A paper describes a structure:
[name] proteins (SLPs) are self-assembling, crystalline proteins coating the cell surfaces of many prokaryotes. We determined the atomic resolution structures of all functional domains (I-III from N- to C-termini) present in the three [name] proteins [name]_ac, SlpX_ac, and [name]_amy. The Lactobacillus S-layers are anchored to the cell wall through interaction with teichoic acids (TA), either lipoteichoic acid ([name]) or wall teichoic acid (WTA).
The general structure of the TAB domain consists of two cell wall binding motifs ([name]_motif) which are connected by a short linker and arranged as an internal homodimer. Mapping of the surface charges indicates a large, highly positively charged region within the interface of the two motifs that extends to the C-terminal part of the protein. [name]_amy_III NMR chemical shift analysis of GroP trimer and GroP pentamer titrations identified two areas corresponding to phosphate-binding sites: The binding area 1 (TAB1) forms an elongated cleft in the central region of the protein, and binding area 2 (TAB2) is located in the exposed region of the C-terminal part. The main difference between the two binding regions is that both [name] motifs contribute to the TAB1 located within the cleft of this domain. With NMR titration experiments, dissociation constants of 3.5 mM and 0.5 mM are determined for GroP trimer and GroP pentamer, respectively, indicating that longer GroP fragments increase binding strength. To obtain a molecular model of the [name]_amy_III in complex with two GroP pentamers, we used a combination of molecular docking based on the NMR-derived chemical shift changes and classical molecular dynamics (MD) simulations. For both TAB1 and TAB2, reliable HADDOCK models were obtained and minimized in energy.
Residue numbers in the entry: 335 to 457
Write the structure that this text describes.
């Protein structure tokens, strides 16, 4: 196997070679793991194979998904405070990692370490 090191950006279920979830302990955000460098496709979904193991994680939890903003947006911390006073502008492409989180009552995507943007603001 040719492998590379990646940072988990979102809690990640461990799947088997058929894309079925296992009960193996989930990988946790900001841990580093060795994966086979090229993703695999299972059921038209992309996964990283963990190096040396028949275990697979979703690429969206590592490389993310590029999404376009339909509204000007603030960036929040998990506490609910604004992370900064910057505004991400409508039409910007922003990478989001995994499934949205509930932050201060709103569904939000993680865009960075302790940085979140409201899901409703994306196209």
């Amino acid at each position: 196997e040719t492998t590379k090191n990646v940072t988990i950006m979102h809690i990640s279920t461990i799947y088997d070679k058929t894309g079925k979830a296992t009960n193996e302990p989930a990988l946790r955000a900001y841990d580093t793991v060795s994966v086979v460098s090229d993703p695999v496709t299972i059921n038209n979904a992309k996964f990283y194979k963990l190096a040396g193991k028949d275990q697979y994680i979703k690429v969206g939890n590592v490389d993310g998904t590029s999404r376009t903003l339909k509204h000007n947006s603030y960036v929040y911390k998990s506490s609910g405070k604004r992370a900064n006073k910057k505004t991400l502008k409508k039409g910007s492409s922003v990478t989001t990692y995994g499934k949205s989180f509930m932050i201060a009552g709103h569904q939000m995507y993680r865009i960075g370490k302790n940085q979140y943007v409201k899901k409703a603001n994306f196209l």
